[PDB]
Paper text:
CAs (E.C. 4.2.1.1) are ubiquitous metalloenzymes that catalyze the reversible hydration of carbon dioxide to bicarbonate (CO2 + H2O ⇋ HCO3– + H+). Here, we report on the first crystal structure of a halophilic γ-class CA (CA_D). The gene was derived from SAG analysis of an uncultured archaeon from the Red Sea Discovery Deep brine pool and was identified using the PPM algorithm. The gene was expressed in the bioengineered haloarchaeon Halobacterium sp.
The monomer contains a seven-turn, left-handed β-helix connected to an α-helix running antiparallel to the β-helix axis. For example, CA_D contains a connecting β-sheet, while Cam consists of an additional α-helix instead. Closer inspection of the active site reveals a zinc ion, coordinated by three histidine residues (His64 chain A, His89 chain B, and His94 chain A). A well-defined water molecule is coordinated to the zinc ion, which acts as the nucleophile in the reaction mechanism of these enzymes. The CA_D trimer contains an overall negative surface potential, while a positive charge is located only in two concentrated locations. The CA_D trimer protein surface contains a decreased number of hydrophobic and polar amino acid residues whilst showing an increased number of charged amino acid residues on the surface as compared to homologs. A closer look at positively and negatively charged amino acids on the trimer surface of CA_D reveals the dominance of glutamate (23.6 vs. 10.5 and 14.4% on the surface of mesophilic and thermophilic homologs, respectively).
Residue numbers in the entry:
A (entry chain B), C (entry chain C): 0 to 177
B (entry chain A): 0 to 176
The structure:
């Protein structure tokens, strides 16, 4: 319901995506099929693009915003790219960062400017992934700053895709009730 | 303004409870007398039940959601249960966990799946109570993950109930406008 | 949209300030010129005043609330006071605190009761500035609790004002559409 234009850029949302009325999608946003956006989530693509893939969960009160960078006298803007089968947890912040496929950004965590969360990895709850930091494949990072705790079990990795499916099926049932 | 059905289940909100119109309540929610829910708070009972008791405050941008837990084949859904006289702080997350009576969940903190905040305890600000962890009676926990800092002094415990009453009174004044 | 009145007192918002429809402003709030408030932000001046200066940014899902401090008998209510050219970051909490001029409160951080963020200082992401804690002029604090990390370089301080202007200009373009 709050699908807002900005500078004549309107969100492109796939017809099988679900955006809850209490989420806020602004500007140059792209959302793929079966991707869900939940109450209070703000996806604000005003200063640069936000691209979200298919079958991804943007959980409640999560904020997604491109970065404005001031290390050069000319101001620079970094887009957000989020891949497929991801869980962006309750109250997580994705700030000018890249999330690849089948990964979990834990609840309340921050993934900051030019960072990259690689496929089949986890950002731990409340963790802060710093500027340009890389979360490696098959690992979980925790704390502030985010540091590697351990490798993920092969079951833990396989249940990410299963979580993405569960939450996409949930979103489908929301869609059926206007 | 956003009390929403889900799969036939409607939020059962007591008449003396206050839900700010900018809060979001969905599905199988039970909210008791004098309990307040503040702007941006999301209480989403779609995958399981959320039960909140009486005189409890769910402060701004707090999120309450049942847990989906993934066993070898079955998916376990874990309901949220929050008791009486609690302060769920600004931007806190209660996720498939249990809060008992007269406790403070501090601002920005997380109480995770299957965790338990016992009566007369505190989760400190920004702390993360990991799954199946108990915050014991009469104690504060801090940091990530949450670990015991010290005992709550006798005065500190009595001011929890007093704070809950102050916030329930504040909500009463919101209801009249 | 949600500029709510409380107990007779209505938000006093300058004509050049910008409040996004999805922000919530309640009660005894004072907002200076060129200041911007963004989706999901809550500025709730109900138990005491909140004063925000000019050219300041209250980013998405940020919460500003006065403090209720509990003494042996009486209850003290502490106002929020936020100065000029500040950045209150995505999902930050300013709770009964004082923020002076040209500072950054980092994303997801807490500035709690009777605390003070001095001019040209910086609260790190996910940090928790405790009760009555000062964030000193020229310095950056991090972690839980908030510990001084280092002095800010002269270039970094110069970019605080520039970031405030960039976001004030952004808000200007939002206000020209609706
Ligand atoms: Na189906
Ligand atoms: Na009364
Ligand atoms: Na201009
Ligand atoms: Zn931003
Ligand atoms: Zn959840
Ligand atoms: Zn408060």
């Amino acid at each position: 319901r709050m699908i807002q234009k900005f500078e004549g850029k309107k969100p492109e949302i796939h017809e099988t995506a679900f955006v809850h009325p209490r989420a806020t999608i602004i500007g140059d946003v792209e959302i793929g099929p079966k991707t869900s956006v939940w109450p209070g989530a703000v996806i604000r693509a005003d200063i640069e693009k936000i691209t979200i893939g298919k079958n991804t969960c943007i959980k409640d009160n999560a904020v997604i915003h491109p970065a404005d960078v001031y290390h050069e006298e000319e101001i620079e803007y970094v887009p957000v790219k989020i891949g497929d089968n991801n869980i962006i947890g309750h109250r997580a912040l994705i700030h000018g960062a890249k999330i690849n496929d089948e990964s979990i950004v834990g609840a309340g965590s921050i993934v900051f400017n030019k960072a990259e969360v690689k496929t089949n990895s986890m950002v731990g709850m409340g963790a802060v992934v710093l500027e340009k930091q890389e979360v490696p494949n098959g690992k979980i990072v925790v704390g502030i700053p985010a540091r590697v705790l351990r490798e993920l079990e092969e079951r833990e990795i396989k249940q990410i895709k299963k979580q993405a499916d569960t939450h996409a099926e949930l979103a489908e049932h929301y869609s059926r009730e206007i």
